[PDB]
Symmetry: C4
Subunit: 95 residues, 4 copies
Protein backbone atom coordinates (compact mmCIF):
# COMPACT_ATOMS: atom_id res chain seq x y z
CA UNK A 1 0.00 0.00 0.00
CA UNK A 2 3.02 2.02 0.96
CA UNK A 3 4.92 0.62 -2.03
CA UNK A 4 1.96 1.39 -4.28
CA UNK A 5 2.06 4.96 -2.97
CA UNK A 6 5.83 5.18 -3.42
CA UNK A 7 5.56 4.11 -7.06
CA UNK A 8 2.72 6.49 -7.92
CA UNK A 9 4.61 9.26 -6.15
CA UNK A 10 7.71 8.64 -8.27
CA UNK A 11 5.67 8.38 -11.47
CA UNK A 12 3.88 11.64 -10.70
CA UNK A 13 7.15 13.45 -10.02
CA UNK A 14 8.63 12.19 -13.30
CA UNK A 15 5.53 13.28 -15.23
CA UNK A 16 5.75 16.77 -13.71
CA UNK A 17 9.48 16.96 -14.44
CA UNK A 18 8.71 16.17 -18.09
CA UNK A 19 6.16 18.97 -18.28
CA UNK A 20 8.44 21.43 -16.50
CA UNK A 21 11.26 20.80 -18.99
CA UNK A 22 8.95 20.91 -22.01
CA UNK A 23 7.00 24.05 -21.13
CA UNK A 24 10.11 25.89 -19.94
CA UNK A 25 11.84 25.11 -23.18
CA UNK A 26 9.18 25.19 -25.91
CA UNK A 27 6.80 27.74 -24.34
CA UNK A 28 9.55 29.75 -22.66
CA UNK A 29 8.10 29.65 -19.16
CA UNK A 30 10.21 30.06 -16.05
CA UNK A 31 10.71 26.54 -14.61
CA UNK A 32 8.50 27.39 -11.61
CA UNK A 33 5.70 28.53 -13.92
CA UNK A 34 6.20 25.38 -16.02
CA UNK A 35 5.77 23.14 -12.98
CA UNK A 36 2.78 25.15 -11.74
CA UNK A 37 1.16 25.01 -15.20
CA UNK A 38 1.85 21.27 -15.50
CA UNK A 39 0.13 20.68 -12.15
CA UNK A 40 -2.83 22.95 -12.98
CA UNK A 41 -3.22 21.08 -16.26
CA UNK A 42 -3.03 17.49 -15.05
CA UNK A 43 -5.33 18.09 -12.04
CA UNK A 44 -7.76 19.65 -14.61
CA UNK A 45 -7.99 22.99 -12.77
CA UNK A 46 -6.87 24.86 -15.89
CA UNK A 47 -6.83 28.50 -14.78
CA UNK A 48 -5.46 29.50 -18.17
CA UNK A 49 -3.05 32.07 -16.78
CA UNK A 50 -0.53 29.99 -18.72
CA UNK A 51 -1.67 28.07 -21.81
CA UNK A 52 0.43 26.89 -24.76
CA UNK A 53 0.93 29.44 -27.52
CA UNK A 54 2.85 27.26 -30.02
CA UNK A 55 1.43 24.42 -32.09
CA UNK A 56 4.16 22.17 -30.68
CA UNK A 57 2.91 23.15 -27.23
CA UNK A 58 -0.75 22.52 -28.05
CA UNK A 59 0.01 19.06 -29.49
CA UNK A 60 2.16 18.12 -26.51
CA UNK A 61 -0.55 19.32 -24.13
CA UNK A 62 -3.15 17.08 -25.80
CA UNK A 63 -0.91 14.04 -25.29
CA UNK A 64 0.27 15.13 -21.83
CA UNK A 65 -3.28 15.40 -20.52
CA UNK A 66 -4.36 12.03 -21.90
CA UNK A 67 -1.29 10.26 -20.53
CA UNK A 68 -0.95 12.21 -17.31
CA UNK A 69 -4.43 12.66 -15.89
CA UNK A 70 -4.84 8.99 -15.05
CA UNK A 71 -1.53 8.96 -13.18
CA UNK A 72 -2.07 12.17 -11.21
CA UNK A 73 -5.52 11.16 -10.01
CA UNK A 74 -4.35 7.66 -9.14
CA UNK A 75 -1.78 9.34 -6.89
CA UNK A 76 -4.36 11.71 -5.43
CA UNK A 77 -6.67 8.80 -4.66
CA UNK A 78 -3.98 6.70 -2.99
CA UNK A 79 -2.82 9.78 -1.11
CA UNK A 80 -6.42 10.22 0.04
CA UNK A 81 -7.24 6.66 1.05
CA UNK A 82 -3.79 5.42 2.12
CA UNK A 83 -2.15 8.38 3.89
CA UNK A 84 -4.64 11.12 4.71
CA UNK A 85 -7.47 8.88 5.87
CA UNK A 86 -5.47 6.84 8.43
CA UNK A 87 -3.98 10.02 9.93
CA UNK A 88 -7.49 11.48 10.21
CA UNK A 89 -8.90 8.40 11.91
CA UNK A 90 -5.85 8.21 14.17
CA UNK A 91 -6.34 11.82 15.27
CA UNK A 92 -9.85 10.78 16.34
CA UNK A 93 -8.64 8.67 19.30
CA UNK A 94 -6.38 10.13 22.00
CA UNK A 95 -3.35 8.11 23.01
Amino acid sequence: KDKEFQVLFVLTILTLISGTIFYSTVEGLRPIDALYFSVVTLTTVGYGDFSPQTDFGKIFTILYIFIGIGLVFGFIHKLAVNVQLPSILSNLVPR
Copy 2:
Protein backbone atom coordinates in the same frame (compact mmCIF):
# COMPACT_ATOMS: atom_id res chain seq x y z
CA LYS B 1 -22.70 7.59 7.70
CA ASP B 2 -23.80 10.76 9.39
CA LYS B 3 -20.58 10.81 11.42
CA GLU B 4 -18.58 10.18 8.25
CA PHE B 5 -20.35 13.16 6.69
CA GLN B 6 -19.79 15.31 9.79
CA VAL B 7 -16.05 14.60 9.71
CA LEU B 8 -15.63 15.29 6.00
CA PHE B 9 -17.68 18.45 6.43
CA VAL B 10 -15.38 19.69 9.19
CA LEU B 11 -12.26 18.74 7.24
CA THR B 12 -13.53 20.56 4.14
CA ILE B 13 -14.31 23.70 6.13
CA LEU B 14 -10.84 23.69 7.70
CA THR B 15 -9.20 23.24 4.29
CA LEU B 16 -11.17 26.19 2.90
CA ILE B 17 -10.32 28.31 5.94
CA SER B 18 -6.63 27.60 5.29
CA GLY B 19 -6.92 28.72 1.68
CA THR B 20 -8.93 31.81 2.61
CA ILE B 21 -6.27 32.94 5.09
CA PHE B 22 -3.39 32.16 2.74
CA TYR B 23 -4.75 33.78 -0.41
CA SER B 24 -6.06 36.82 1.47
CA THR B 25 -2.68 37.34 3.01
CA VAL B 26 -0.10 36.32 0.40
CA GLU B 27 -2.08 37.15 -2.75
CA GLY B 28 -3.92 40.11 -1.21
CA LEU B 29 -7.42 38.94 -2.04
CA ARG B 30 -10.47 40.06 -0.11
CA PRO B 31 -11.40 37.16 2.21
CA ILE B 32 -14.57 36.48 0.20
CA ASP B 33 -12.55 36.26 -3.02
CA ALA B 34 -10.03 34.02 -1.24
CA LEU B 35 -12.75 31.59 -0.18
CA TYR B 36 -14.37 31.68 -3.63
CA PHE B 37 -11.00 31.07 -5.30
CA SER B 38 -10.16 28.25 -2.89
CA VAL B 39 -13.46 26.54 -3.73
CA VAL B 40 -13.08 27.07 -7.49
CA THR B 41 -9.58 25.59 -7.24
CA LEU B 42 -10.30 22.48 -5.16
CA THR B 43 -13.44 21.55 -7.13
CA THR B 44 -11.21 21.91 -10.27
CA VAL B 45 -13.50 24.47 -11.93
CA GLY B 46 -10.61 26.94 -12.22
CA TYR B 47 -12.20 29.97 -13.89
CA GLY B 48 -8.93 31.85 -13.55
CA ASP B 49 -10.55 35.14 -12.61
CA PHE B 50 -8.25 34.83 -9.61
CA SER B 51 -4.98 32.90 -9.95
CA PRO B 52 -1.81 33.24 -7.85
CA GLN B 53 0.60 35.94 -8.98
CA THR B 54 3.44 35.29 -6.50
CA ASP B 55 5.82 32.33 -6.52
CA PHE B 56 4.83 31.65 -2.91
CA GLY B 57 1.24 31.52 -4.11
CA LYS B 58 1.99 29.21 -7.04
CA ILE B 59 3.92 26.77 -4.82
CA PHE B 60 1.18 26.76 -2.18
CA THR B 61 -1.45 26.19 -4.87
CA ILE B 62 0.40 23.12 -6.17
CA LEU B 63 0.40 21.60 -2.68
CA TYR B 64 -3.13 22.80 -1.84
CA ILE B 65 -4.61 21.10 -4.90
CA PHE B 66 -2.82 17.80 -4.30
CA ILE B 67 -3.81 17.70 -0.63
CA GLY B 68 -7.26 19.24 -0.97
CA ILE B 69 -8.86 17.72 -4.05
CA GLY B 70 -9.22 14.28 -2.49
CA LEU B 71 -10.93 15.76 0.57
CA VAL B 72 -13.34 18.05 -1.29
CA PHE B 73 -14.53 15.31 -3.64
CA GLY B 74 -14.87 12.83 -0.80
CA PHE B 75 -17.22 15.35 0.81
CA ILE B 76 -19.09 15.94 -2.44
CA HIS B 77 -19.55 12.19 -2.91
CA LYS B 78 -20.81 11.60 0.62
CA LEU B 79 -23.04 14.64 0.29
CA ALA B 80 -24.39 13.09 -2.91
CA VAL B 81 -24.93 9.52 -1.74
CA ASN B 82 -25.69 10.11 1.95
CA VAL B 83 -27.78 13.31 2.08
CA GLN B 84 -29.06 14.31 -1.35
CA LEU B 85 -30.02 10.84 -2.55
CA PRO B 86 -32.20 9.86 0.45
CA SER B 87 -34.05 13.19 0.31
CA ILE B 88 -34.66 12.64 -3.41
CA LEU B 89 -35.98 9.12 -2.92
CA SER B 90 -38.08 10.29 0.03
CA ASN B 91 -39.68 13.03 -2.07
CA LEU B 92 -40.73 10.25 -4.47
CA VAL B 93 -43.33 8.77 -2.07
CA PRO B 94 -46.11 10.91 -0.57
CA ARG B 95 -46.72 10.62 3.15
Copy 3:
Protein backbone atom coordinates in the same frame (compact mmCIF):
# COMPACT_ATOMS: atom_id res chain seq x y z
CA LYS C 1 -32.26 1.84 -14.84
CA ASP C 2 -34.41 3.84 -17.19
CA LYS C 3 -36.30 5.32 -14.23
CA GLU C 4 -33.00 6.10 -12.52
CA PHE C 5 -31.93 7.91 -15.69
CA GLN C 6 -35.26 9.74 -15.96
CA VAL C 7 -34.94 11.03 -12.39
CA LEU C 8 -31.34 12.19 -12.75
CA PHE C 9 -32.28 13.82 -16.05
CA VAL C 10 -35.09 15.78 -14.39
CA LEU C 11 -32.90 16.74 -11.44
CA THR C 12 -30.13 17.95 -13.75
CA ILE C 13 -32.56 20.05 -15.79
CA LEU C 14 -33.97 21.65 -12.63
CA THR C 15 -30.46 22.42 -11.35
CA LEU C 16 -29.57 24.09 -14.65
CA ILE C 17 -32.83 26.04 -14.66
CA SER C 18 -31.94 27.36 -11.20
CA GLY C 19 -28.53 28.53 -12.38
CA THR C 20 -29.95 30.07 -15.55
CA ILE C 21 -32.45 32.14 -13.56
CA PHE C 22 -29.90 33.16 -10.94
CA TYR C 23 -27.06 34.16 -13.24
CA SER C 24 -29.39 35.92 -15.69
CA THR C 25 -30.85 37.93 -12.87
CA VAL C 26 -28.02 38.62 -10.41
CA GLU C 27 -25.09 38.63 -12.86
CA GLY C 28 -27.09 40.08 -15.75
CA LEU C 29 -26.25 37.39 -18.28
CA ARG C 30 -28.43 36.62 -21.26
CA PRO C 31 -30.38 33.44 -20.38
CA ILE C 32 -28.42 31.45 -22.98
CA ASP C 33 -25.12 32.59 -21.46
CA ALA C 34 -26.48 31.78 -17.99
CA LEU C 35 -27.31 28.21 -19.02
CA TYR C 36 -23.97 27.80 -20.82
CA PHE C 37 -22.10 29.15 -17.78
CA SER C 38 -24.07 26.92 -15.40
CA VAL C 39 -23.14 23.87 -17.49
CA VAL C 40 -19.48 24.89 -17.80
CA THR C 41 -19.38 25.35 -14.03
CA LEU C 42 -21.05 22.14 -12.89
CA THR C 43 -19.10 19.93 -15.34
CA THR C 44 -15.95 21.67 -13.91
CA VAL C 45 -14.74 22.87 -17.33
CA GLY C 46 -14.67 26.47 -16.10
CA TYR C 47 -13.50 28.43 -19.15
CA GLY C 48 -13.95 31.66 -17.23
CA ASP C 49 -15.40 33.57 -20.17
CA PHE C 50 -18.24 34.18 -17.72
CA SER C 51 -17.51 34.22 -13.98
CA PRO C 52 -19.50 35.90 -11.21
CA GLN C 53 -18.65 39.55 -10.59
CA THR C 54 -20.91 40.19 -7.56
CA ASP C 55 -20.39 38.87 -4.05
CA PHE C 56 -23.92 37.43 -4.18
CA GLY C 57 -22.85 35.62 -7.34
CA LYS C 58 -19.61 34.30 -5.85
CA ILE C 59 -21.40 32.97 -2.74
CA PHE C 60 -24.12 31.33 -4.82
CA THR C 61 -21.49 29.76 -7.08
CA ILE C 62 -19.71 28.19 -4.10
CA LEU C 63 -22.96 26.55 -2.98
CA TYR C 64 -24.09 25.71 -6.53
CA ILE C 65 -20.89 23.80 -7.27
CA PHE C 66 -20.97 21.83 -4.03
CA ILE C 67 -24.63 20.88 -4.46
CA GLY C 68 -24.64 20.49 -8.23
CA ILE C 69 -21.45 18.67 -9.17
CA GLY C 70 -22.54 15.40 -7.60
CA LEU C 71 -25.84 15.50 -9.50
CA VAL C 72 -24.40 16.42 -12.90
CA PHE C 73 -21.76 13.70 -12.81
CA GLY C 74 -24.24 11.13 -11.57
CA PHE C 75 -26.27 11.94 -14.68
CA ILE C 76 -23.21 11.81 -16.92
CA HIS C 77 -22.26 8.41 -15.51
CA LYS C 78 -25.73 6.93 -15.93
CA LEU C 79 -25.90 8.43 -19.40
CA ALA C 80 -22.57 6.73 -20.12
CA VAL C 81 -23.27 3.29 -18.69
CA ASN C 82 -27.04 3.05 -19.26
CA VAL C 83 -27.68 4.72 -22.63
CA GLN C 84 -24.47 5.26 -24.59
CA LEU C 85 -22.85 1.92 -23.81
CA PRO C 86 -25.78 -0.31 -24.89
CA SER C 87 -26.16 1.62 -28.16
CA ILE C 88 -22.43 1.19 -28.80
CA LEU C 89 -22.49 -2.54 -28.14
CA SER C 90 -25.66 -2.88 -30.22
CA ASN C 91 -24.01 -1.14 -33.18
CA LEU C 92 -21.31 -3.83 -32.95
CA VAL C 93 -23.59 -6.64 -34.20
CA PRO C 94 -25.47 -6.37 -37.51
CA ARG C 95 -29.14 -7.28 -37.50
Copy 4:
Protein backbone atom coordinates in the same frame (compact mmCIF):
# COMPACT_ATOMS: atom_id res chain seq x y z
CA LYS D 1 -9.56 -5.74 -22.54
CA ASP D 2 -7.59 -4.89 -25.62
CA LYS D 3 -10.79 -4.87 -27.68
CA GLU D 4 -12.46 -2.69 -25.05
CA PHE D 5 -9.53 -0.29 -25.36
CA GLN D 6 -9.64 -0.39 -29.16
CA VAL D 7 -13.33 0.54 -29.16
CA LEU D 8 -12.99 3.39 -26.67
CA PHE D 9 -9.99 4.63 -28.63
CA VAL D 10 -12.00 4.73 -31.86
CA LEU D 11 -14.97 6.37 -30.14
CA THR D 12 -12.73 9.03 -28.60
CA ILE D 13 -11.09 9.80 -31.94
CA LEU D 14 -14.49 10.15 -33.63
CA THR D 15 -15.73 12.47 -30.86
CA LEU D 16 -12.65 14.67 -31.26
CA ILE D 17 -13.03 14.69 -35.04
CA SER D 18 -16.60 15.93 -34.58
CA GLY D 19 -15.46 18.77 -32.35
CA THR D 20 -12.58 19.68 -34.66
CA ILE D 21 -14.93 20.00 -37.64
CA PHE D 22 -17.57 21.91 -35.68
CA TYR D 23 -15.30 24.43 -33.96
CA SER D 24 -13.21 25.00 -37.10
CA THR D 25 -16.33 25.71 -39.07
CA VAL D 26 -18.75 27.49 -36.72
CA GLU D 27 -16.21 29.22 -34.45
CA GLY D 28 -13.62 29.73 -37.20
CA LEU D 29 -10.72 28.10 -35.39
CA ARG D 30 -7.76 26.62 -37.20
CA PRO D 31 -8.27 22.82 -37.20
CA ILE D 32 -5.35 22.35 -34.79
CA ASP D 33 -6.87 24.86 -32.36
CA ALA D 34 -10.25 23.14 -32.77
CA LEU D 35 -8.79 19.76 -31.82
CA TYR D 36 -6.82 21.28 -28.92
CA PHE D 37 -9.94 23.09 -27.67
CA SER D 38 -12.06 19.95 -28.02
CA VAL D 39 -9.55 18.01 -25.91
CA VAL D 40 -9.23 20.76 -23.29
CA THR D 41 -13.02 20.85 -23.06
CA LEU D 42 -13.79 17.14 -22.77
CA THR D 43 -10.98 16.47 -20.25
CA THR D 44 -12.51 19.42 -18.26
CA VAL D 45 -9.23 21.39 -18.16
CA GLY D 46 -10.93 24.39 -19.77
CA TYR D 47 -8.13 26.96 -20.05
CA GLY D 48 -10.49 29.31 -21.85
CA ASP D 49 -7.90 30.50 -24.35
CA PHE D 50 -10.52 29.35 -26.84
CA SER D 51 -14.19 29.39 -25.84
CA PRO D 52 -17.25 29.56 -28.11
CA GLN D 53 -18.32 33.05 -29.14
CA THR D 54 -21.49 32.17 -31.08
CA ASP D 55 -24.78 30.96 -29.62
CA PHE D 56 -24.59 27.95 -31.95
CA GLY D 57 -21.17 27.25 -30.46
CA LYS D 58 -22.34 27.61 -26.86
CA ILE D 59 -25.31 25.26 -27.42
CA PHE D 60 -23.14 22.68 -29.16
CA THR D 61 -20.58 22.89 -26.34
CA ILE D 62 -23.26 22.16 -23.73
CA LEU D 63 -24.27 18.99 -25.59
CA TYR D 64 -20.69 18.05 -26.52
CA ILE D 65 -19.57 18.11 -22.88
CA PHE D 66 -22.51 16.06 -21.64
CA ILE D 67 -22.10 13.44 -24.36
CA GLY D 68 -18.32 13.46 -24.56
CA ILE D 69 -17.01 13.61 -21.01
CA GLY D 70 -18.16 10.10 -20.16
CA LEU D 71 -16.44 8.70 -23.24
CA VAL D 72 -13.14 10.54 -22.82
CA PHE D 73 -12.75 9.54 -19.18
CA GLY D 74 -13.73 5.96 -19.91
CA PHE D 75 -10.84 5.93 -22.38
CA ILE D 76 -8.48 7.58 -19.91
CA HIS D 77 -9.39 5.02 -17.26
CA LYS D 78 -8.90 2.03 -19.55
CA LEU D 79 -5.68 3.57 -20.80
CA ALA D 80 -4.61 3.87 -17.16
CA VAL D 81 -5.58 0.42 -15.90
CA ASN D 82 -5.14 -1.63 -19.09
CA VAL D 83 -2.05 -0.20 -20.82
CA GLN D 84 -0.05 2.07 -18.53
CA LEU D 85 -0.31 -0.04 -15.39
CA PRO D 86 0.95 -3.34 -16.91
CA SER D 87 3.90 -1.56 -18.54
CA ILE D 88 4.74 0.03 -15.18
CA LEU D 89 4.59 -3.27 -13.31
CA SER D 90 6.57 -4.96 -16.08
CA ASN D 91 9.33 -2.35 -15.83
CA LEU D 92 9.58 -3.30 -12.14
CA VAL D 93 11.11 -6.75 -12.84
CA PRO D 94 14.27 -7.15 -14.93
CA ARG D 95 14.23 -9.79 -17.64
